[PDB]
Amino acid sequence: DVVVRLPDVAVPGEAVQASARQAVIHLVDIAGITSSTPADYATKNLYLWNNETCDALSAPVADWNDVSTTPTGSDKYGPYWVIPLTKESGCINVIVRDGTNKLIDSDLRVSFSDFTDRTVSVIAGNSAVYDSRADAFRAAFGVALADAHWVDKTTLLWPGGENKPIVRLYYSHSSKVAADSNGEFSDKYVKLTPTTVNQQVSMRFPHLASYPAFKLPDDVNVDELLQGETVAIAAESDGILSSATQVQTAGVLDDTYAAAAEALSYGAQLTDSGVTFRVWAPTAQQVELVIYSADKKVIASHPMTRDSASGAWSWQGGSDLKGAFYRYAMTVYHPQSRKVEQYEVTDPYAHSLSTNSEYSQVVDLNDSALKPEGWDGLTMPHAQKTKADLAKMTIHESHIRDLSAWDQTVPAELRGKYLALTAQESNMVQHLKQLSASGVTHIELLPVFDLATVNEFSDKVADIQQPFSRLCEVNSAVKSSEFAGYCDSGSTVEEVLTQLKQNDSKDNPQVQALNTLVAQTDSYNWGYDPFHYTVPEGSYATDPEGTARIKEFRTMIQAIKQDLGMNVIMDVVYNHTNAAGPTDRTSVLDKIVPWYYQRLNETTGSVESATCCSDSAPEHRMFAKLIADSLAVWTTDYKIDGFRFDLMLYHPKAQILSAWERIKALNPDIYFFGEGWDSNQSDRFEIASQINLKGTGIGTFSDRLRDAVRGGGPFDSGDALRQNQGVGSGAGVLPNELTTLSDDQARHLADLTRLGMAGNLADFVLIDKDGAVKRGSEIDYNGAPGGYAADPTEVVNYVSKHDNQTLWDMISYKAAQEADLDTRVRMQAVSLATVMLGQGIAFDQQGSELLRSKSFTRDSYDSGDWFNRVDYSLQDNNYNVGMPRSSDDGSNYDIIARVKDAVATPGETELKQMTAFYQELTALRKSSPLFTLGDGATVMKRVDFRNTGADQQTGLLVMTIDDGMQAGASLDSRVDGIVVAINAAPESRTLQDFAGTSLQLSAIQQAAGDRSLASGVQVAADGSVTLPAWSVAVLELPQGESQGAGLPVSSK
Ligand SMILES: OC[C@H]1O[C@H](O[C@H]2[C@H](O)[C@@H](O)[C@@H](O[C@H]3[C@H](O)[C@@H](O)[C@@H](O[C@H]4[C@H](O)[C@@H](O)[C@@H](O)O[C@@H]4CO)O[C@@H]3CO)O[C@@H]2CO)[C@H](O)[C@@H](O)[C@@H]1O
Ligand SMILES: OC[C@H]1O[C@H](O[C@H]2[C@H](O)[C@@H](O)[C@@H](O[C@H]3[C@H](O)[C@@H](O)[C@@H](O[C@H]4[C@H](O)[C@@H](O)[C@@H](O)O[C@@H]4CO)O[C@@H]3CO)O[C@@H]2CO)[C@H](O)[C@@H](O)[C@@H]1O
Ligand SMILES: OC[C@H]1O[C@H](O[C@H]2[C@H](O)[C@@H](O)[C@@H](O)O[C@@H]2CO)[C@H](O)[C@@H](O)[C@@H]1O
Ligand SMILES: [Ca+2]
Ligand SMILES: [Ca+2]
Ligand SMILES: [Ca+2]
Ligand SMILES: [Ca+2]
Ligand SMILES: [Ca+2]
């Protein structure tokens, strides 16, 4: 077997050697094998200058604009420069250029001690200095990238080995694989041979199925090779290296250890009789369990016991370890750094933590001391068993700080804390209590698992309610900013921001300028930055040290379900981690089992960031297990009723379903839903998207009705934000001065809205804008089939959410100048009516009932208490409180300045008016089982629409729900049918469709009088119904002695 070595004969020689008092620099640039003339290097030049570090340069030409330092000469291997030196010692500063641009960015320092002959060579885009053109030429023949994949015991997929006489897998336990001084690779290796990828590997990794396959000997000691670095190397029959790359081992890790590891349980598993610690680390060379005292002093370090079959490490001790802090000391090779790292890491299965997640803690969640009184008997206030039960789901998407950060009626020590939900006398809790009584059924919580983006050490944080002096002491960026003068003032940050409002504008966005600095060290963040998946966040607890947060979190859950009467949904973010690699403080999973828990680029091995951050790999067996095990704890130990999967689309459909099967065994009525957009991961596996999840029972947010009612889309910027009016803001019927929307375009949005109100079903049949008969799947949504679901319970409709601009801000961007304040409040209610009175599950942003504004901020995740403010004292809706963050909304400053002051900012009168409209809508939603049929087939048999086709009155939505003899059994003893009429237009409209039918206005709306969305509606003696501008009316056919004729769905 020939020894592999770097090129040594077919290598470029030296153009010239540096003589006395001079240096020489070669720019390796070999011409084509077909070249016939000397290459042109007239534009090639060097920028020479000497400073403190290097002053050997003799008379260095200044002025960067000078390009006169061109090549002294050139040959087939590139040009070269003869630099006049002042001495043959020290060094020189050089930057290779091609005119004015840099061929090599980084500054180059040529050390005369490193290269005695003062004759070096460099290459474009390398930045490294070589002693010869030959060495530089060989540099391209070293270990680079990581496009070789060891997918199973004996299969290695690597493009670089194709048609290569010598293909080997070199390995080193404690060293980095690299050619020695002789240019040879003396490290040990195993021979590879061309083979054909098996169906097994093909099915597991479809995206790698076309890669050249190589077979390892069956007697290969996989375990030992996985303990260190492995490099795939290829060379010619003569032993000259062709290429060498790093190896991605996730596949072989699953094939070798997954099954055995899946059968075990992880974390610090404490029982009253003892404790067993277990962590999966199949590639680690050593793992020690480090025990810390309360004061964080090492009490003991225990070498753990490795299980050969699973690659898991365990240690068993006594029950006295209850409450102890701990970390796992790892000795493991990390492919990113290429070295055997040594570091302590918290437990990925941690269930308790110290302040700021620095140490994990041993805990038994079953302990009565960690449970509020009566916890075990806590019941779910709303049923989720049948589809009809699920359809009644009406969600209020909330955030811990958004809820109480500004409520002065919430005790000061509970503001921004889980416990604020227990302050029964506060404006916030009383408000939620009334929303519940009116029909809101679920509270959805933005990230309450352990996030990383808020420092849990209180002395390291400064909030706007505190002195500016505190902000300066904890934030050095502020102290060195233009705001430094406020440091020794006597004002609070909030007071300063308030004073900056008058002079704030697109030309001087000073409010956001200061707030951007504040955001770095405040207590605010949505928290889509996972540090630990199965421990509550610490900053939301009154005491973040230890187990305390567990009981407080439970107390909150109990308060919501028992005292507020609502179910609880948790936002989970298993699609990515806060960080990866061997150095970041928050990298947990990627430190323990490098390159396994993250999804990597097939060629470079780099952790992908499509989610925003450090993409995870739910397709890998042990991560799928971690996810399922985590959900089990939130379900059983925290009694969560449902989960909203953030970026669920980055998860395999099969993984989400498997997790659901596992959790249903714990809570048979648990509900799963999430964002099912397109993750572009279809080449790797079938994704959990709106389309692929049809008929599975897993819900997905629908962007159809959302965009049709709000107007436009999430990618709009500039004037498009105003031009793209929606059904809720008068598309077609009340055009603003910039829009060019046609009647046809407006009617298309109405088609999408009606389809959504019927549950966005693929098979629901309706009459479209042109009078044509169409199935939901035939109504187009930006190029894709509109209706995608099998049952309405698989669809979550909404017109506002934490992401993107609030509904009020959108209406402010789109409303015609002539639409007065009162009309805009009704537009907000009309927009929400399409969701609340529809068959799909209803979802809404906390505060929509208060016309919530973020001062036009599109993505407010780190915009603090200021832009995310919700005033439960009802003074205003937080509109017009300063221009939004310039980094992301700066391009919208012009349009904002133009539309912002069209009308007055909402006050208590408007907020009370909107809350009334909102509670009327939610009360109507639950006033009859007809609004929430649940089953798709039933929706198709009972739901229909009027005012459709080419002769329709634009903006008028009329939906009928049959309960008559032709629909089947009477589901509502009080009525034979219901009519939902939403007149989203500035004209009064008269319905003649129900003449001689004895229609009556809902008792709930009648009770509200002139405060009803139906105020002014008239039901004439001839049976005609007239609706005022921007109104919503729910009419009913009273049921007599027996079931009536109802409102049968028309044959189409
Ligand atoms: O590195 C990835 C990107 O990360 C950052 O983007 C953020 C956005 O700023 C957030 O707003 C949010 O994005 C949401 C988005 O607001 C929401 O509308 C939705 O997008 C859907 C869309 O609604 C739907 O109709 C259809 O078009 O599919 C879209 C998704 O393809 O979901 C988004 C979720 O991403 O979160 C992302 C982070 O993921 C960063 O700002 C970007 O520069 C970066 O590219
Ligand atoms: O840390 C390395 C990475 O740093 C940078 O990423 C930034 C993004 O550019 C920011 O946009 C932000 O990401 C936020 C995002 O702005 C916010 O909207 C939220 O996104 C959620 C969304 O709300 C949710 O509904 C759903 O769509 O999922 C989204 C993603 O979870 O949360 C994001 C994460 O906090 O912050 C990150 C981190 O600083 C840099 O741009 C990256 O290239 C780099 O990898
Ligand atoms: O003048 C010494 C100075 O040279 C270089 O600075 C360049 C810079 O790299 C260019 O991008 C552009 O800005 O022109 C500068 C010179 O005018 C080095 O980068 C710098 O370290 C060095 O001090
Ligand atoms: Ca040399
Ligand atoms: Ca945290
Ligand atoms: Ca912040
Ligand atoms: Ca990809
Ligand atoms: Ca009935």
PDB file of C-alpha atoms in Angstrom, residues 124-340:
ATOM      1  CA  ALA A 124      -5.991  34.838  -3.963  1.00  0.00           C
ATOM      2  CA  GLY A 125      -8.472  34.573  -1.106  1.00  0.00           C
ATOM      3  CA  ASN A 126      -6.057  32.701   1.161  1.00  0.00           C
ATOM      4  CA  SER A 127      -4.452  35.327   3.422  1.00  0.00           C
ATOM      5  CA  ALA A 128      -1.790  32.813   4.484  1.00  0.00           C
ATOM      6  CA  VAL A 129       1.924  33.276   3.772  1.00  0.00           C
ATOM      7  CA  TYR A 130       4.053  30.475   2.316  1.00  0.00           C
ATOM      8  CA  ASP A 131       7.812  29.984   1.937  1.00  0.00           C
ATOM      9  CA  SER A 132       7.517  28.746  -1.657  1.00  0.00           C
ATOM     10  CA  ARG A 133       5.106  28.626  -4.595  1.00  0.00           C
ATOM     11  CA  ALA A 134       5.221  24.846  -4.190  1.00  0.00           C
ATOM     12  CA  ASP A 135       4.051  24.935  -0.567  1.00  0.00           C
ATOM     13  CA  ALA A 136       1.276  27.372  -1.475  1.00  0.00           C
ATOM     14  CA  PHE A 137       0.310  25.069  -4.347  1.00  0.00           C
ATOM     15  CA  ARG A 138       0.039  22.128  -1.945  1.00  0.00           C
ATOM     16  CA  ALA A 139      -2.126  24.150   0.459  1.00  0.00           C
ATOM     17  CA  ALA A 140      -5.096  23.325  -1.770  1.00  0.00           C
ATOM     18  CA  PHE A 141      -4.412  19.646  -1.082  1.00  0.00           C
ATOM     19  CA  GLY A 142      -5.128  19.567   2.635  1.00  0.00           C
ATOM     20  CA  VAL A 143      -8.106  18.730   4.841  1.00  0.00           C
ATOM     21  CA  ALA A 144     -10.958  20.998   3.754  1.00  0.00           C
ATOM     22  CA  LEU A 145     -14.751  21.086   4.067  1.00  0.00           C
ATOM     23  CA  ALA A 146     -16.661  18.087   5.438  1.00  0.00           C
ATOM     24  CA  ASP A 147     -18.541  16.558   2.513  1.00  0.00           C
ATOM     25  CA  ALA A 148     -17.988  12.925   3.498  1.00  0.00           C
ATOM     26  CA  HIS A 149     -20.832  11.259   5.406  1.00  0.00           C
ATOM     27  CA  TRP A 150     -20.452   8.090   7.479  1.00  0.00           C
ATOM     28  CA  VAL A 151     -24.154   7.156   7.400  1.00  0.00           C
ATOM     29  CA  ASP A 152     -24.084   3.619   8.805  1.00  0.00           C
ATOM     30  CA  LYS A 153     -21.657   0.975  10.073  1.00  0.00           C
ATOM     31  CA  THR A 154     -19.993   0.298   6.710  1.00  0.00           C
ATOM     32  CA  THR A 155     -21.223   3.037   4.371  1.00  0.00           C
ATOM     33  CA  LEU A 156     -19.375   6.254   3.604  1.00  0.00           C
ATOM     34  CA  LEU A 157     -20.860   8.677   1.071  1.00  0.00           C
ATOM     35  CA  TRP A 158     -18.276  11.042  -0.410  1.00  0.00           C
ATOM     36  CA  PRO A 159     -18.094  12.748  -3.848  1.00  0.00           C
ATOM     37  CA  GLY A 160     -14.337  13.296  -3.669  1.00  0.00           C
ATOM     38  CA  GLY A 161     -13.503   9.600  -3.767  1.00  0.00           C
ATOM     39  CA  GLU A 162     -15.206   8.959  -7.101  1.00  0.00           C
ATOM     40  CA  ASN A 163     -12.926   7.463  -9.756  1.00  0.00           C
ATOM     41  CA  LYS A 164      -9.993   7.600  -7.343  1.00  0.00           C
ATOM     42  CA  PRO A 165      -7.559   4.629  -7.134  1.00  0.00           C
ATOM     43  CA  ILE A 166      -6.999   5.206  -3.411  1.00  0.00           C
ATOM     44  CA  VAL A 167      -9.878   5.912  -1.018  1.00  0.00           C
ATOM     45  CA  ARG A 168      -9.192   5.697   2.718  1.00  0.00           C
ATOM     46  CA  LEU A 169     -10.605   6.764   6.076  1.00  0.00           C
ATOM     47  CA  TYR A 170      -7.793   8.061   8.274  1.00  0.00           C
ATOM     48  CA  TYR A 171      -8.321   8.376  12.021  1.00  0.00           C
ATOM     49  CA  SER A 172      -6.581   9.774  15.088  1.00  0.00           C
ATOM     50  CA  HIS A 173      -7.744   9.311  18.676  1.00  0.00           C
ATOM     51  CA  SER A 174      -6.133  12.408  20.180  1.00  0.00           C
ATOM     52  CA  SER A 175      -4.556  14.155  17.207  1.00  0.00           C
ATOM     53  CA  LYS A 176      -5.485  16.170  14.141  1.00  0.00           C
ATOM     54  CA  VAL A 177      -4.957  14.406  10.812  1.00  0.00           C
ATOM     55  CA  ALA A 178      -2.400  16.307   8.723  1.00  0.00           C
ATOM     56  CA  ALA A 179       0.637  15.687   6.517  1.00  0.00           C
ATOM     57  CA  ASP A 180       3.950  15.529   8.383  1.00  0.00           C
ATOM     58  CA  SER A 181       7.123  17.462   7.538  1.00  0.00           C
ATOM     59  CA  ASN A 182       7.847  14.887   4.831  1.00  0.00           C
ATOM     60  CA  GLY A 183       4.496  15.729   3.268  1.00  0.00           C
ATOM     61  CA  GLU A 184       3.195  12.298   4.233  1.00  0.00           C
ATOM     62  CA  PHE A 185       0.179  11.138   6.229  1.00  0.00           C
ATOM     63  CA  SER A 186       1.603   8.737   8.808  1.00  0.00           C
ATOM     64  CA  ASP A 187      -1.654   8.454  10.754  1.00  0.00           C
ATOM     65  CA  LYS A 188      -3.514   5.141  10.845  1.00  0.00           C
ATOM     66  CA  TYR A 189      -6.371   4.404   8.439  1.00  0.00           C
ATOM     67  CA  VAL A 190      -8.851   1.874   7.069  1.00  0.00           C
ATOM     68  CA  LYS A 191      -9.309   0.996   3.392  1.00  0.00           C
ATOM     69  CA  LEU A 192     -12.474   1.909   1.504  1.00  0.00           C
ATOM     70  CA  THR A 193     -13.879   0.245  -1.611  1.00  0.00           C
ATOM     71  CA  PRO A 194     -16.505   1.388  -4.152  1.00  0.00           C
ATOM     72  CA  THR A 195     -19.972   0.011  -3.416  1.00  0.00           C
ATOM     73  CA  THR A 196     -23.646   0.771  -4.073  1.00  0.00           C
ATOM     74  CA  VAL A 197     -25.773   2.608  -1.506  1.00  0.00           C
ATOM     75  CA  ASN A 198     -28.308   0.235   0.041  1.00  0.00           C
ATOM     76  CA  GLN A 199     -32.043   0.918   0.093  1.00  0.00           C
ATOM     77  CA  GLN A 200     -31.765   1.399   3.859  1.00  0.00           C
ATOM     78  CA  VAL A 201     -29.403   4.382   3.681  1.00  0.00           C
ATOM     79  CA  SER A 202     -31.244   5.657   0.615  1.00  0.00           C
ATOM     80  CA  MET A 203     -34.550   5.852   2.494  1.00  0.00           C
ATOM     81  CA  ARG A 204     -32.923   7.388   5.572  1.00  0.00           C
ATOM     82  CA  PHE A 205     -31.076  10.095   3.634  1.00  0.00           C
ATOM     83  CA  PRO A 206     -32.741  10.661   0.217  1.00  0.00           C
ATOM     84  CA  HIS A 207     -30.709  13.853  -0.226  1.00  0.00           C
ATOM     85  CA  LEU A 208     -27.410  11.921  -0.162  1.00  0.00           C
ATOM     86  CA  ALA A 209     -28.601   8.956  -2.235  1.00  0.00           C
ATOM     87  CA  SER A 210     -26.766  10.214  -5.331  1.00  0.00           C
ATOM     88  CA  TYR A 211     -23.383  10.506  -3.604  1.00  0.00           C
ATOM     89  CA  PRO A 212     -20.617   8.054  -4.581  1.00  0.00           C
ATOM     90  CA  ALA A 213     -20.716   5.195  -2.046  1.00  0.00           C
ATOM     91  CA  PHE A 214     -17.777   3.495  -0.326  1.00  0.00           C
ATOM     92  CA  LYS A 215     -17.694   0.343   1.797  1.00  0.00           C
ATOM     93  CA  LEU A 216     -15.740  -0.116   5.047  1.00  0.00           C
ATOM     94  CA  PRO A 217     -14.556  -3.556   6.207  1.00  0.00           C
ATOM     95  CA  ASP A 218     -17.108  -5.451   8.312  1.00  0.00           C
ATOM     96  CA  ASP A 219     -14.486  -5.912  11.033  1.00  0.00           C
ATOM     97  CA  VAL A 220     -14.156  -2.145  11.459  1.00  0.00           C
ATOM     98  CA  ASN A 221     -14.032  -0.987  15.077  1.00  0.00           C
ATOM     99  CA  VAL A 222     -16.623   1.776  14.687  1.00  0.00           C
ATOM    100  CA  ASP A 223     -16.672   2.610  18.402  1.00  0.00           C
ATOM    101  CA  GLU A 224     -12.956   3.388  18.526  1.00  0.00           C
ATOM    102  CA  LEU A 225     -12.933   5.464  15.341  1.00  0.00           C
ATOM    103  CA  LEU A 226     -15.887   7.518  16.598  1.00  0.00           C
ATOM    104  CA  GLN A 227     -13.851   8.414  19.701  1.00  0.00           C
ATOM    105  CA  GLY A 228     -11.685  10.821  17.734  1.00  0.00           C
ATOM    106  CA  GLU A 229     -11.248  12.550  14.400  1.00  0.00           C
ATOM    107  CA  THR A 230     -11.825  10.812  11.084  1.00  0.00           C
ATOM    108  CA  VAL A 231     -10.844  12.192   7.683  1.00  0.00           C
ATOM    109  CA  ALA A 232     -11.704  10.823   4.254  1.00  0.00           C
ATOM    110  CA  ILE A 233      -8.705  10.956   1.930  1.00  0.00           C
ATOM    111  CA  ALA A 234      -8.396  10.152  -1.770  1.00  0.00           C
ATOM    112  CA  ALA A 235      -5.316   9.905  -3.981  1.00  0.00           C
ATOM    113  CA  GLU A 236      -4.012   8.736  -7.353  1.00  0.00           C
ATOM    114  CA  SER A 237      -2.481   5.301  -7.952  1.00  0.00           C
ATOM    115  CA  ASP A 238       0.949   6.871  -7.407  1.00  0.00           C
ATOM    116  CA  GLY A 239       0.050   8.011  -3.896  1.00  0.00           C
ATOM    117  CA  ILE A 240      -0.399  11.710  -4.644  1.00  0.00           C
ATOM    118  CA  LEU A 241      -3.296  13.157  -2.636  1.00  0.00           C
ATOM    119  CA  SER A 242      -6.311  14.457  -4.562  1.00  0.00           C
ATOM    120  CA  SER A 243      -8.408  15.679  -1.620  1.00  0.00           C
ATOM    121  CA  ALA A 244      -9.202  15.149   2.069  1.00  0.00           C
ATOM    122  CA  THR A 245     -12.273  16.177   4.066  1.00  0.00           C
ATOM    123  CA  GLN A 246     -13.881  15.897   7.503  1.00  0.00           C
ATOM    124  CA  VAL A 247     -16.615  13.326   8.193  1.00  0.00           C
ATOM    125  CA  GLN A 248     -20.207  13.904   9.372  1.00  0.00           C
ATOM    126  CA  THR A 249     -21.070  10.964  11.637  1.00  0.00           C
ATOM    127  CA  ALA A 250     -24.697  11.515  12.706  1.00  0.00           C
ATOM    128  CA  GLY A 251     -25.935   8.668  10.530  1.00  0.00           C
ATOM    129  CA  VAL A 252     -23.572   5.995  11.818  1.00  0.00           C
ATOM    130  CA  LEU A 253     -24.243   7.214  15.356  1.00  0.00           C
ATOM    131  CA  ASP A 254     -27.957   6.433  14.969  1.00  0.00           C
ATOM    132  CA  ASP A 255     -27.301   3.141  13.189  1.00  0.00           C
ATOM    133  CA  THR A 256     -24.883   2.063  15.925  1.00  0.00           C
ATOM    134  CA  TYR A 257     -26.438   3.384  19.157  1.00  0.00           C
ATOM    135  CA  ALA A 258     -29.967   4.771  18.642  1.00  0.00           C
ATOM    136  CA  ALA A 259     -32.073   1.684  19.369  1.00  0.00           C
ATOM    137  CA  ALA A 260     -30.212   0.817  22.569  1.00  0.00           C
ATOM    138  CA  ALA A 261     -30.170   4.458  23.681  1.00  0.00           C
ATOM    139  CA  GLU A 262     -33.886   4.979  22.947  1.00  0.00           C
ATOM    140  CA  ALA A 263     -34.764   2.225  25.427  1.00  0.00           C
ATOM    141  CA  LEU A 264     -33.252   4.224  28.319  1.00  0.00           C
ATOM    142  CA  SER A 265     -34.348   7.272  30.331  1.00  0.00           C
ATOM    143  CA  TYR A 266     -32.215  10.378  30.839  1.00  0.00           C
ATOM    144  CA  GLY A 267     -31.385  13.197  33.243  1.00  0.00           C
ATOM    145  CA  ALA A 268     -31.005  13.189  37.036  1.00  0.00           C
ATOM    146  CA  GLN A 269     -33.716  10.672  37.852  1.00  0.00           C
ATOM    147  CA  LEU A 270     -34.501  11.090  41.522  1.00  0.00           C
ATOM    148  CA  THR A 271     -36.813   8.884  43.557  1.00  0.00           C
ATOM    149  CA  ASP A 272     -37.221   8.896  47.328  1.00  0.00           C
ATOM    150  CA  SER A 273     -34.993   5.792  47.277  1.00  0.00           C
ATOM    151  CA  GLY A 274     -32.063   7.046  45.193  1.00  0.00           C
ATOM    152  CA  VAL A 275     -30.833   8.798  42.052  1.00  0.00           C
ATOM    153  CA  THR A 276     -29.555   7.673  38.663  1.00  0.00           C
ATOM    154  CA  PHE A 277     -27.913  10.183  36.324  1.00  0.00           C
ATOM    155  CA  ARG A 278     -27.766   9.391  32.612  1.00  0.00           C
ATOM    156  CA  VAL A 279     -26.560  11.354  29.598  1.00  0.00           C
ATOM    157  CA  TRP A 280     -26.157  10.211  25.986  1.00  0.00           C
ATOM    158  CA  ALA A 281     -22.607  10.854  24.731  1.00  0.00           C
ATOM    159  CA  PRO A 282     -21.586   8.080  22.256  1.00  0.00           C
ATOM    160  CA  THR A 283     -18.415   9.823  21.037  1.00  0.00           C
ATOM    161  CA  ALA A 284     -17.074  11.132  24.359  1.00  0.00           C
ATOM    162  CA  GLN A 285     -13.717   9.795  25.554  1.00  0.00           C
ATOM    163  CA  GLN A 286     -14.545  10.595  29.186  1.00  0.00           C
ATOM    164  CA  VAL A 287     -17.509  11.918  31.165  1.00  0.00           C
ATOM    165  CA  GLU A 288     -17.478  12.858  34.846  1.00  0.00           C
ATOM    166  CA  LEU A 289     -20.439  13.880  36.993  1.00  0.00           C
ATOM    167  CA  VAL A 290     -19.483  17.043  38.857  1.00  0.00           C
ATOM    168  CA  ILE A 291     -21.478  17.781  42.023  1.00  0.00           C
ATOM    169  CA  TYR A 292     -21.654  21.353  43.349  1.00  0.00           C
ATOM    170  CA  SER A 293     -22.717  22.790  46.695  1.00  0.00           C
ATOM    171  CA  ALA A 294     -25.272  25.600  46.908  1.00  0.00           C
ATOM    172  CA  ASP A 295     -22.381  28.076  46.858  1.00  0.00           C
ATOM    173  CA  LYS A 296     -21.157  26.396  43.656  1.00  0.00           C
ATOM    174  CA  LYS A 297     -18.037  24.741  45.074  1.00  0.00           C
ATOM    175  CA  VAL A 298     -17.064  21.308  43.744  1.00  0.00           C
ATOM    176  CA  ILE A 299     -18.108  18.701  46.310  1.00  0.00           C
ATOM    177  CA  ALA A 300     -17.196  15.702  44.171  1.00  0.00           C
ATOM    178  CA  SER A 301     -16.313  14.622  40.642  1.00  0.00           C
ATOM    179  CA  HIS A 302     -17.501  11.139  39.694  1.00  0.00           C
ATOM    180  CA  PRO A 303     -16.188   9.329  36.634  1.00  0.00           C
ATOM    181  CA  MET A 304     -19.308   7.910  34.971  1.00  0.00           C
ATOM    182  CA  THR A 305     -19.884   4.385  33.646  1.00  0.00           C
ATOM    183  CA  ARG A 306     -20.208   4.006  29.870  1.00  0.00           C
ATOM    184  CA  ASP A 307     -22.711   1.535  28.413  1.00  0.00           C
ATOM    185  CA  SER A 308     -21.185   0.012  25.273  1.00  0.00           C
ATOM    186  CA  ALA A 309     -24.462  -0.777  23.480  1.00  0.00           C
ATOM    187  CA  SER A 310     -26.045   2.678  23.833  1.00  0.00           C
ATOM    188  CA  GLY A 311     -23.120   5.031  24.268  1.00  0.00           C
ATOM    189  CA  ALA A 312     -24.866   6.447  27.333  1.00  0.00           C
ATOM    190  CA  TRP A 313     -23.053   7.252  30.579  1.00  0.00           C
ATOM    191  CA  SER A 314     -24.596   6.735  34.006  1.00  0.00           C
ATOM    192  CA  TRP A 315     -23.901   7.089  37.715  1.00  0.00           C
ATOM    193  CA  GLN A 316     -26.044   5.918  40.624  1.00  0.00           C
ATOM    194  CA  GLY A 317     -26.125   7.543  44.059  1.00  0.00           C
ATOM    195  CA  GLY A 318     -28.248   8.143  47.141  1.00  0.00           C
ATOM    196  CA  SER A 319     -31.379  10.218  47.702  1.00  0.00           C
ATOM    197  CA  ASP A 320     -29.268  12.729  49.631  1.00  0.00           C
ATOM    198  CA  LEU A 321     -28.349  14.181  46.237  1.00  0.00           C
ATOM    199  CA  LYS A 322     -31.836  15.691  46.037  1.00  0.00           C
ATOM    200  CA  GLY A 323     -31.450  19.405  45.304  1.00  0.00           C
ATOM    201  CA  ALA A 324     -27.756  19.183  44.414  1.00  0.00           C
ATOM    202  CA  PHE A 325     -26.343  21.218  41.540  1.00  0.00           C
ATOM    203  CA  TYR A 326     -24.392  19.429  38.834  1.00  0.00           C
ATOM    204  CA  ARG A 327     -22.785  19.456  35.397  1.00  0.00           C
ATOM    205  CA  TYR A 328     -21.169  16.881  33.134  1.00  0.00           C
ATOM    206  CA  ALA A 329     -17.430  17.312  32.574  1.00  0.00           C
ATOM    207  CA  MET A 330     -16.873  16.249  28.982  1.00  0.00           C
ATOM    208  CA  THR A 331     -13.718  15.129  27.174  1.00  0.00           C
ATOM    209  CA  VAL A 332     -14.894  14.914  23.576  1.00  0.00           C
ATOM    210  CA  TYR A 333     -13.720  15.611  20.030  1.00  0.00           C
ATOM    211  CA  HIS A 334     -15.595  18.481  18.370  1.00  0.00           C
ATOM    212  CA  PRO A 335     -15.388  18.522  14.529  1.00  0.00           C
ATOM    213  CA  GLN A 336     -15.801  22.309  14.331  1.00  0.00           C
ATOM    214  CA  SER A 337     -12.603  22.991  16.299  1.00  0.00           C
ATOM    215  CA  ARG A 338     -10.965  19.667  15.392  1.00  0.00           C
ATOM    216  CA  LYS A 339      -9.752  19.147  18.947  1.00  0.00           C
ATOM    217  CA  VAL A 340     -10.581  17.035  21.984  1.00  0.00           C
TER     218      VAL A 340
END
